[PDB]
Amino acid sequence: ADCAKGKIEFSKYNEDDTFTVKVDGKEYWTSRWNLQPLLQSAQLTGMTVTIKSSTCESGSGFAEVQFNND
Amino acid sequence: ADCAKGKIEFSKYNEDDTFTVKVDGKEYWTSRWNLQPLLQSAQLTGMTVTIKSSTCESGSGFAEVQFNND
Amino acid sequence: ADCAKGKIEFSKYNEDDTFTVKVDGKEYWTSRWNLQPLLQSAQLTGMTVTIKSSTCESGSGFAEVQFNND
Amino acid sequence: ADCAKGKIEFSKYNEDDTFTVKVDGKEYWTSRWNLQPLLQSAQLTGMTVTIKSSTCESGSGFAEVQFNND
Amino acid sequence: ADCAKGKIEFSKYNEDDTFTVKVDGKEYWTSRWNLQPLLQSAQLTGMTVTIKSSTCSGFAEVQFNND
Amino acid sequence: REFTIDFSTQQSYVSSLNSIRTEISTPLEHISQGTTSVSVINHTPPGSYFAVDIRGLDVYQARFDHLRLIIEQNNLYVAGFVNTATNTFYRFSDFTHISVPGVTTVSMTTDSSYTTLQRVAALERSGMQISRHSLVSSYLALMEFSGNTMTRDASRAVLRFVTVTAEALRFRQIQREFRQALSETAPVYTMTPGDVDLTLNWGRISNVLPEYRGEDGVRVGRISFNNISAILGTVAVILNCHQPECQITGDRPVIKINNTLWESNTAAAFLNRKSQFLYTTGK
């Protein structure tokens, strides 16, 4: 599902080494190591990211994310 | 062969560990993690990238890409 | 606990490969490798971070940090 | 020997996971993965790089490079 | 000890995968790979770096300050 | 405050835009030649707007003259459009703080984001065509529009009119490219990806250009300027960043690197990578 599309309001490095972003008022975590710099770069430049996951409730995990310029 | 040349319109990491970029209206993917920061930096700085591959069909994988400031 | 919230006043790479940041006048170290460039980029752009740890005295360790847009 | 000195004219990720830069009209490749983002940063920021190698023929390999600002 | 303090005058990736920086007229190298981006970033953004070491050759402690 | 944008000729159109800019903004000391500058919007209280009367869609004719745009002054956003024949202000949902006296205000369910407008319009800005003919069509669509929810044709009309008014006010590049469509040849203006990127980076540009002091270049995300003529040929009006659009994160507008003025956040976003071998092997 398309869970959230928006700018990253904050990011957090978690105790379990996963990485959380808050997008459109909801928090999503990912364990994908490749995504950590990319997500911070998106936060730094105000990229619109699209978080896709099988569940979209705040606190859901994700592995799929699109990085847009618009 | 030169498959696509232009700025990166969007990039996307997929649950299946592929990384898609869209260049000049065409989508290609790579699973080289080396290319994820390189491509995302190219996207956020407006580099012209040239996607190169033996064959250039849509949805093709790639692992050769040239980076130009202009 | 949220130990310190503010900009990174300095950062330091340590002999034991941990990484120290000074935030709100207190020093904190982390052994999370992936935090090293993320903190340095936060530092260079004046990003506010929130250090979270069991103990908040200067010299405490952390494994969790929030990158804010303040 | 100093093979080439100047700004990076283009960079290119190669299918064998090596990385080519063109400097002062000559092309060199490196198999050192750590150099890929560093060279990209240099290219983005207009650093003057000095390619150093025992073989300075264009198309040759390198694993030593100096980075200078203006 | 603070071996050197100042801006990075140049950096260099070496054939043995170490990394050299010149600071305040003196050259130092490190074998710690994660210091390679950290140092180059400091060089590009104009950070003051403080190279620290028991003997002031190689280093693996360095402080970064914005200018 | 009311202004006319007159589409009769390239002269009348550029004259209209220049007059608006002169009234609502002040040149940057370091990016100004003659009376052609990058200008900073003068501070107005929140909710302040100016009106733009659309004229000259039919060259020099007093017809097609019932469209007015309401523009929030501090950010140049189009808050909605007025049918002056019906005295009705159709106002986007993100502008409930914009109060216009004397008109019937219709509060719309539709917000003004480009994401929303492009979706409802079934029209992407990248590749969007604008001509005198499609501006007349857009005008008619907006005059026919009724109700609280934007239709496809009303949204297409707003995309076209916002591009040639507010976005052209911001960007001399868009002014220059679009104005060819007003000539007797009546060519088509096609909005480019570069045009779109400029509009999307307006806030970031606005935060960086006040720091410019004659550096050899300016880099703001995907946007690059190599000299003052490129700056002036591209940008005309920026936000006053001394608005929420001025800041993304952090507090450092710029870093000078090798005599280029970088948006600090752009540099940070490619200097936050760890060692490549460790990144790629740490799956």
Residue numbers in the entry:
A (entry chain D), B (entry chain E), C (entry chain C), D (entry chain F): 1 to 70
E (entry chain B): 1 to 56, 60 to 70
F (entry chain A): 1 to 242, 257 to 297
Describing publication, verbatim:
All Stx proteins consist of a catalytic A-subunit and a B-subunit pentamer. The B-subunit pentamer functions to bind Galα–Galβ–Glcβ-ceramide (Gb3), a glycolipid present on the surface of target cells.
To elucidate the precise manner by which these shorter peptides bind to Stx2a, X-ray crystallography analysis was performed with co-crystals of each peptide and the Stx2a holotoxin, which were obtained via the soaking method. We were able to determine electron densities for AR4A-mono, R4A-mono, R3A-mono, and R2A-mono, and X-ray crystal structures were solved to final resolutions of 1.80, 1.80, 1.90, and 1.75 Å-resolution, respectively. The amide group of the Ala10, but not its side chain, interacts with the Val78, Ser112 and Arg170 residues. Overall, we find that the binding patterns of these shorter peptides are almost identical to that of MMβA-mono. Combined with results from the competition assay, these data demonstrate that these shorter peptides efficiently bind to the A-subunit of Stx2a, and R2A-mono is the minimal essential motif needed for binding. All peptides, including R2A-mono, were found to efficiently inhibit Stx2a toxicity, confirming that R2A-mono, which is a minimal essential motif for binding, is sufficient for effective inhibition of Stx2a.
